[PDB]
Design brief:
The structure is a homodimer.
Chain A (H helix, E strand, L loop, with lengths): L1 E2 L6 E6 L2 E7 L6 E3 L9 E7 L2 E15 L2 E9 L6 E2 L1 H4 L5 E3 L1
Parallel strand pairs in A: 3-8, 4-7
Antiparallel strand pairs in A: 2-3, 2-6, 5-6, 6-7
The complex binds the ligand Cc1cccc(C)c1OCC(=O)N[C@@H](Cc1ccccc1)[C@@H](O)C(=O)N1CSC(C)(C)[C@H]1C(=O)N[C@H]1c2ccccc2C[C@H]1O.
Chain lengths: 99, 99
């Protein structure tokens, strides 16, 4: 698809068998999702945004679908304001910026 | 141009007669630049994301150049950790996400 930016680039994702809304976010290095249950062990990570820093849980090799495109990679879980698909998975689905 | 997402999509912008590096950020509704002078009236605004909110000055009808493309729009000025080109100006240069 080609997604214009007149509104927020919100898309449907599937993670843990559940449909959710997430923002395709080229300003995010990594993908961050609101509190939910994911399998496996997690590792600590601190991430910095416009308002400062938050602690998140880092899960690796997580299966996730983004607009029907299958990806498997790192998903951070924590108090993000909106679910964000960041560059780590945008690259997996072959997403680019174009003008 | 086509910009891949293996690294942060940073570009050079011209604003208020100054050159600055900024992040092409599809997660940002608006454009925010570190402290600098801009012409005209402004009003205060709070903007929020990861880590919470910061206070900025909102300047309207500001001309910026991004990769040879002139655009006009609202520019916020304040203590942002990274200079950010948001959707309000990305649309104007005809920037889209594609996969
Ligand atoms: C650096 C890093 C490492 C690992 C993992 C991650 C996720 C990561 O990125 C962190 C991050 O937050 N990145 C920022 C970009 C940024 C990087 C570094 C410092 C500050 C901002 C990006 O993802 C974003 O714009 N965001 C995210 S929350 C949001 C509401 C969707 C939106 C935002 O603030 N949006 C707000 C915004 C921003 C600028 C102007 C106006 C407005 C209004 C809101 O739309």
């Amino acid at each position: 698809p080609q997604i214009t930016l007149w509104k927020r680039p919100l898309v449907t994702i599937k993670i843990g068998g559940q449909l959710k809304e997430a923002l395709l976010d080229t300003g995010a290095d990594d993908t961050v999702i609101e509190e939910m249950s994911l399998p496996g062990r997690w590792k600590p990570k601190m991430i910095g945004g416009i308002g400062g820093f938050i602690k998140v849980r880092q899960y690796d090799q997580i299966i996730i679908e983004i607009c029907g495109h299958k990806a498997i990679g790192t998903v951070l879980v924590g108090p993000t304001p909106v679910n964000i698909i960041g560059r780590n998975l945008l690259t997996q689905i072959g997403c680019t910026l174009n003008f």
